[PDB]
Amino acid sequence: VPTPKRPRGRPKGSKNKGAAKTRKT
DNA sequence: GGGAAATTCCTC
DNA sequence: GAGGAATTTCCC
DSSP states (O other): OOSSSOOSSOOTTOOOOSOOSOOOO
16 A cells, blocks of 8 residues: 555565575485 | 675566 | 466575
8 A cells, every 4th residue: 555566676575485595306 | 895695577 | 267477576
């Protein structure tokens, strides 16, 4: 309700869920 | 102060 | 309606 369009970016306290790293097995 | 990952807004 | 592109934040 305060600002209309939200800016582009990663919210505060957003942790990474899926790791884009390579798996071992 | 740089890099990486995630979310959002805009065009066709 | 759906997809592509751009910007922000956290950690070392």
